[PDB]
Amino acid sequence: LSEQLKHCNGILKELLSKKHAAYAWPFYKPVDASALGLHDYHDIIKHPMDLSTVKRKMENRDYRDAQEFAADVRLMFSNCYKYNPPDHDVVAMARKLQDVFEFRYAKMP
Numbered sequence: 001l002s003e004q005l006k007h008c009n010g011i012l013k014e015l016l017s018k019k020h021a022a023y024a025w026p027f028y029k030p031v032d033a034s035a036l037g038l039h040d041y042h043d044i045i046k047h048p049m050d051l052s053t054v055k056r057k058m059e060n061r062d063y064r065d066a067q068e069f070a071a072d073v074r075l076m077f078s079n080c081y082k083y084n085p086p087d088h089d090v091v092a093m094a095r096k097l098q099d100v101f102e103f104r105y106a107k108m109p
């Protein structure tokens, strides 16, 4: 499972890499609801998640297994699908980044 966590870290590095930046950027940092004018965000999203938080948790050895890591990445996408109308540009970006994630997560050793 150290090996599986390394695979997860590789995925995380890929999600944060320039290769995917055109659609990954909304997920780099926590949603700043006040700054974005989304004053209902924290009434709708109980557990915010974003890639910088996933990165901090990986660096701190918070995740004990791949499944725990994947649950946080998927929570990040689910929050996006929950809050935004399905035709929002951010949702199209989420779907593309989640495709990157799911196909590489499936290659877990």
Ligand SMILES: Cc1ccc2ncccc2c1-c1cc(-c2c(C)noc2C)cc2[nH]c(C3CC3)nc12
Residues within 6 Å of the ligand: 025, 026, 027, 031, 036, 038, 079, 080, 083, 084, 089, 090, 093
């Ligand atoms: C609010 C908003 C409006 C139009 C957008 N158009 C394209 C992509 C994201 C858009 C955004 C936008 C959306 C989100 C976001 C995510 C992810 N999940 O739910 C929401 C809501 C985060 C953002 N962060 C930023 C800036 C970096 C600080 N913009 C955005």
